[PDB]
């Protein structure tokens, strides 16, 4: 159970390589009992470990203009609202009351849906930079 | 000046609103063309079977709601788009 | 205020019932649009061929049953859906 | 209680009989919708061109034969199906 025994086992199973055992021990200490550790090819000459806390999925923004910080080229929202819609969002008329209520609230909004077509994306992005609502899709 | 004939009415289509029920800007096909216009010129009246003419109920200066159709025509006068269309397409008068 | 012309009437359609003959909730395409509405504004009357005008039979405040068709139009007045429709499409009046 | 407008009539179609000229029962598409109904409500009458109104020939309580078509509409009143249709669509009256 202790980290020393885990490091020793990882070293022995890796053809007596101390660094691999130490890295695996640190990774399993950080990620917890229920976590998952994966191995992929790197780019440099030294191994590295990246730990992700929270939830993360491989889906990005649907429009580059949603970016509010060009310094890092990323969209960041503080205390947002999350709308979960499992229906094909095509016409803006379906989203009027929610956007009006959130604009009355005054805090950013995030839409997680499978897809959004061109018209609704254009309406949202137009609303973004004008200072009405801060929305990411 | 331009005057219609019989029961045709000259109207000026109002600008389409960009904000609907709040500050949200509507752009694209969601913002439908306005169905409200300002009447400009009114003809003498529709001709009856007997031969007499009756004046129109709509008066110049009012705001009317009309339905777009095949009988509605768009003409360019005084470098400004106007609509020449029959009185039968007027649905209601605002105020 | 909105007033019609000739034989047109302003109605607002009643909300579609969710419970039909019991507590079963009807959702989807089964719940069709209601064919009953409350009349709001009534025009002066239809213009006859000879020239005189006759008032409508339907009076403001009654519940009417109307047939949806190409002649019925829906307008966005004062943030409230209403229907402009010719009196010929009125079928019957409740009570 | 509902009363129709002008020259329209409330009828309820009779049940489709399964016994047909003997003991053989008919089930499926062979048993077509009955073309006979009982009149329930009758309007004041059709409006003539000159202006006066003439009462309908059909009286409430008689059995009529009607040709179902596009002008015949079915509504639910008192949780019971009834038909609104123009008097000109009445074909003949039994007895």
From Swiss-Prot, chain A:
Q: What is the species listed in this Swiss-Prot or TrEMBL entry?
A: Escherichia coli (strain K12)
- List the subcellular locations: Cytoplasm
Taxonomically, what lineage is the organism? Bacteria, Pseudomonadati, Pseudomonadota, Gammaproteobacteria, Enterobacterales
The source's domain of life comes to: Bacteria
Tell me, in a sentence or two, what this protein's role is.
Together with its co-chaperonin GroES, plays an essential role in assisting protein folding. The GroEL-GroES system forms a nano-cage that allows encapsulation of the non-native substrate proteins and provides a physical environment optimized to promote and accelerate protein folding, probably by preventing aggregation and by entropically destabilizing folding intermediates. Also plays a role in coupling between replication of the F plasmid and cell division of the cell.
**Domain statement:** Each subunit is composed of an apical domain that binds non-folded proteins and GroES, an intermediate domain and an equatorial domain that binds ATP and is involved in inter-ring interactions. Forms a large central channel that appears to traverse the entire length of the cylinder with no obstruction. The central channel of GroEL functions as two cavities, one in each ring, that are separated from each other by the crystallographically disordered 23-amino-acid C-terminal segments of the seven subunits. The entry and exit of polypeptide seem to be restricted to the apical end of each ring.
Describe, as the record does, how this protein assembles with itself and its partners: Forms a cylinder of 14 subunits composed of two heptameric rings stacked back-to-back. Interacts with the co-chaperonin GroES. Can form asymmetrical complexes, composed of one GroEL and one GroES, and symmetrical complexes, formed between one GroEL and two GroES oligomers. The asymmetrical complex is the functional unit. It was suggested that the symmetric heterooligomer may represent a transient intermediate in the chaperonin protein folding cycle.
**Coiled coil spans:** none
From the Swiss-Prot or TrEMBL record, give the protein name.
Chaperonin GroEL
Q: How is it modified after translation?
A: Phosphorylated reversibly during heat shock. Can be UMPylated on a tyrosine residue by SelO/YdiU, probably under stress conditions.
Q: Which family does it belong to?
A: Belongs to the chaperonin (HSP60) family.
Curated annotation (Swiss-Prot), chains B, C, D:
UniProt keyword list: Chaperone, Cytoplasm
Under SUPFAM superfamilies, the record lists:
GroES-like (SSF50129)
Q: Where in the cell is it found?
A: Cytoplasm
Q: Which GO terms describe its biological process?
A: chaperone cofactor-dependent protein refolding; protein folding; response to heat; virion assembly
| Gene Ontology CC terms, in alphabetical order | cytosol; GroEL-GroES complex
- In Pfam terms, one family for this protein is Cpn10
A GO molecular function held by the record:
protein-folding chaperone binding
- Annotated positions of the N6-succinyllysine modification: 33
Report activity regulation: Activity of the GroEL-GroES chaperonin complex requires Mg-ATP.
Record family assignment: Belongs to the GroES chaperonin family.
Q: What does this protein do?
A: Together with the chaperonin GroEL, plays an essential role in assisting protein folding. The GroEL-GroES system forms a nano-cage that allows encapsulation of the non-native substrate proteins and provides a physical environment optimized to promote and accelerate protein folding, probably by preventing aggregation and by entropically destabilizing folding intermediates. GroES binds to the apical surface of the GroEL ring, thereby capping the opening of the GroEL channel. Regulates the ATPase activity of GroEL. (Microbial infection) Essential for the assembly of several bacteriophages.
Subunit structure of this chain's protein: Heptamer of 7 subunits arranged in a ring. Interacts with the chaperonin GroEL. Can form asymmetrical complexes, composed of one GroEL and one GroES, and symmetrical complexes, formed between one GroEL and two GroES oligomers. The asymmetrical complex is the functional unit. It was suggested that the symmetric heterooligomer may represent a transient intermediate in the chaperonin protein folding cycle. Another study shows that the symmetric heterooligomers are substantially populated only in the presence of proteins that cannot be folded by the chaperonin.
What is the name of the protein in this document? Co-chaperonin GroES
* Species of origin: Escherichia coli (strain K12)
């Amino acid at each position: 159970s202790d980290s020393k025994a885990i490091a020793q086992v990882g070293t022995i199973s890796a053809n007596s390589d101390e660094t691999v055992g130490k890295l695996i021990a640190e990774a399993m200490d950080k990620v917890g009992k229920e976590g998952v550790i994966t191995v992929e090819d790197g780019t440099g000459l030294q191994d590295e470990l990246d730990v992700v806390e929270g939830m993360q999925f491989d889906r990005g923004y649907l429009s580059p203009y949603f970016i509010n910080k060009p310094e890092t080229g990323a969209v960041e929202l503080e205390s947002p609202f999350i709308l979960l819609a499992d229906k094909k969002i095509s016409n803006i008329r379906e989203m009027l009351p929610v956007l009006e209520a959130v604009a009355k609230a005054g805090k950013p909004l995030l839409i997680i849906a499978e897809d959004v077509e061109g018209e609704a994306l254009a309406t949202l992005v137009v609303n973004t930079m004008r200072g009405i609502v801060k929305v990411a899709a | 000046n331009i005057r219609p004939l019989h029961d045709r009415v000259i109207v000026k289509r109002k600008e389409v609103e960009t904000k609907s029920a709040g500050g949200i800007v509507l752009t694209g096909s969601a913002a439908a063309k306005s169905t409200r216009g300002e009447v400009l010129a009114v003809g003498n009246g529709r001709i009856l079977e007997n031969g007499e003419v009756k004046p129109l109920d709509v008066k110049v200066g009012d705001i009317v709601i009309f339905n777009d159709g095949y009988g509605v025509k768009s003409e360019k006068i005084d470098n400004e788009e106007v609509l020449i269309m029959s009185e039968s397409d007027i649905l209601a008068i605002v105020e």
